[PDB]
Amino acid sequence: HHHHHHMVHITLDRNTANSWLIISKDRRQVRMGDTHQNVSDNKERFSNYPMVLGAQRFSSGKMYWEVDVTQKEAWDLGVCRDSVQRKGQFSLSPENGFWTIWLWQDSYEAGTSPQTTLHIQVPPCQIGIFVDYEAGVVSFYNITDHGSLIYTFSECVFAGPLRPFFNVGFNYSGGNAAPLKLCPL
Ligand SMILES: CC(=O)N1CCC[C@H](CNS(C)(=O)=O)C1
């Protein structure tokens, strides 16, 4: 692909983070902590899942960023509406304001309803995410496999400002402690 020129500098918003997450000082990395991270509760925090939003809000234009997923067993990545539900149980779907892909139990899937099987021959260590607000497009690219397309959501109905969306996943296995990292431009 040739979307690299729409690269944007994404930072994580501490105030949206589940209370067990540890966001690095530069706001470019996030990982699961082994306990509550000693923060007060607020209405922005994701309560049920290890999720956090980017600080940036997008309402127009073309945007591109890259995320490092090296050695993780489980994660969700993409964009979501600024107004997504924060508390309680919910599914990742366009109907709920999310445009995401994920890794879970050795399979990759797109967050449609119901979910769609992805066909990845080269397990990605970095994922590229492209958003075209006007076109209603969210695309995912396998940076490890020369930028090969993973999935395109088209005819998206964003219906509001978008924020970068992250889930570091649970670490019940002891094999999913590694961080999500926003890769340099
Ligand atoms: C992320 C979160 O809200 N919580 C609360 C309940 C217990 C969970 C245990 N953490 S785990 C999967 O072992 O890494 C962590």
UniProtKB/Swiss-Prot annotation:
Segments forming domain B30.2/SPRY: 8-185
Induction or repression: Up-regulated by IFN.
Main localization of the protein described in the UniProt heading: cytoplasm
Keyword terms of this UniProt record: Cell cycle, Coiled coil, Cytoplasm, Cytoplasmic vesicle, DNA-binding, Metal-binding, Nucleus, Ribonucleoprotein, RNA-binding, Transferase, Ubl conjugation, Ubl conjugation pathway, Zinc, Zinc-finger
Keyword presence, Nucleus: yes
UniProt PTM comment: Autoubiquitinated; does not lead to its proteasomal degradation. Deubiquitinated by USP4; leading to its stabilization. Autoubiquitinated.
BP terms from Gene Ontology: negative regulation of innate immune response; negative regulation of NF-kappaB transcription factor activity; negative regulation of protein deubiquitination; positive regulation of autophagy; positive regulation of cell cycle; positive regulation of protein binding; protein autoubiquitination; protein destabilization
GO CC list: autophagosome; cytoplasm; cytoplasmic stress granule; cytoplasmic vesicle; nucleus; P-body; ribonucleoprotein complex
Gene Ontology MF terms in the entry: DNA binding; RNA binding; ubiquitin protein ligase activity; ubiquitin-protein transferase activity; zinc ion binding
Entry keyword annotation includes Ribonucleoprotein: yes
Compartment list: Cytoplasm; Cytoplasmic vesicle, Autophagosome; Nucleus; Cytoplasm, P-body
Record text on subunit structure and interactions: Homotrimer. Component of a SCF(SKP2)-like complex containing CUL1, SKP1, TRIM21 and SKP2. Interacts with CALR, CUL1, FBXW11, HSPA5, IKBKB, IRF3, SKP1 and VCP. Interacts with SKP2; the interaction with SKP2 does not depend on an intact F-box domain. Interacts (via N-terminus and C-terminus) with DCP2 (via N-terminus and C-terminus). Interacts (via C-terminus) with IRF8 (via C-terminus). Interacts with ULK1, BECN1 and with ATG8 family members, including GABARAP, GABARAPL1, GABARAPL2 and MAP1LC3C/LC3C. Interacts with TRIM21 and SQSTM1/sequestosome 1. Interacts with IRF3.
Family: Belongs to the TRIM/RBCC family.
Domain description: The coiled-coil is necessary for the cytoplasmic localization. The RING-type zinc finger is necessary for ubiquitination and for the IRF3-driven interferon beta promoter activity. Interacts with SKP2 and CUL1 in a RING finger-independent manner. The RING-type zinc finger is necessary for ubiquitination of NMI.
Known role: E3 ubiquitin-protein ligase whose activity is dependent on E2 enzymes, UBE2D1, UBE2D2, UBE2E1 and UBE2E2. Forms a ubiquitin ligase complex in cooperation with the E2 UBE2D2 that is used not only for the ubiquitination of USP4 and IKBKB but also for its self-ubiquitination. Component of cullin-RING-based SCF (SKP1-CUL1-F-box protein) E3 ubiquitin-protein ligase complexes such as SCF(SKP2)-like complexes. A TRIM21-containing SCF(SKP2)-like complex is shown to mediate ubiquitination of CDKN1B ('Thr-187' phosphorylated-form), thereby promoting its degradation by the proteasome.
Protein name listed in UniProt: E3 ubiquitin-protein ligase TRIM21
Organism: Mus musculus (Mouse)
Gene transcribed to yield this protein: Trim21
Shown segment, full-protein numbering: 291 to 468 of 470
